[PDB]
Amino acid sequence: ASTDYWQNWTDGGGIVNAVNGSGGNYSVNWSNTGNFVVGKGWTTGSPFRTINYNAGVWAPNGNGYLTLAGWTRSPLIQYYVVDSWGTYRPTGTYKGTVKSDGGTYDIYTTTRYNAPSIDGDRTTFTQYWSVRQSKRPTGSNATITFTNHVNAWKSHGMNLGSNWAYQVMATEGYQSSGSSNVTVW
Ligand SMILES: [Zn+2]
Numbered sequence: 001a002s003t004d005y006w007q008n009w010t011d012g013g014g015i016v017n018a019v020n021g022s023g024g025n026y027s028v029n030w031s032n033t034g035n036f037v038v039g040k041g042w043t044t045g046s047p048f049r050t051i052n053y054n055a056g057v058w059a060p061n062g063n064g065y066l067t068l069a070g071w072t073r074s075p076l077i078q079y080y081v082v083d084s085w086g087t088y089r090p091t092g093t094y095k096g097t098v099k100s101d102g103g104t105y106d107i108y109t110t111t112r113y114n115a116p117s118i119d120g121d122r123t124t125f126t127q128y129w130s131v132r133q134s135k136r137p138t139g140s141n142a143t144i145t146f147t148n149h150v151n152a153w154k155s156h157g158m159n160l161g162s163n164w165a166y167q168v169m170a171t172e173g174y175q176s177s178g179s180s181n182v183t184v185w
Pocket of ligand 1: 096097152155156
């Protein structure tokens with residue numbers, strides 16, 4: 001299924017100029033920001049989805065992630081499959097590794113307290129991460145075979161909730177400027 005969801009959230013810090021392009025394409029040009037997440041994908045995520053993308057521009061200046069991002073409820077969990085980043089490689093409690101789509105990813109868990117989520121501005125939730133051990137080349141078609149991540153997570157005691165919310169291929173940034181241009185399908 002082609003994309004049906006446009007994610008465009010900023011906490012209000014700095015400038016986040018997001019463009020909802022044709023089909024699965026979008027761009028972001030951002031300046032001196034707080035936290036934001038822009039991307040395209042699906043209203044209802046699936047553990048079985050294969051996400052395709054092509055980042056024709058990946059140019060963070062500071063902390064930016066080029067990442068699958070999505071949520072479940074019951075329980076409320078944020079997950080990531082981070083393919084590239086800027087000045088900061090996100091880490092947490094180390095769980096293990098998974099190989100998928102030509103890369104090796106470290107698996108991490110973190111917790112957020114009093115943080116923004118799909119449920120409110122001040123919420124507490126767990127985050128599940130796969131973070132590639134090196135930045136993935138950009139500019140060619142790429143796949144994220146999410147099932148591989150879900151299955152590895154499960155094997156390390158990281159179960160997702162039962163009620164699936166959005167699932168996008170995102171540009172997330174914090175305290176940074178940059179440019180990105182990504183097509184998702
Ligand atoms: Zn393992």
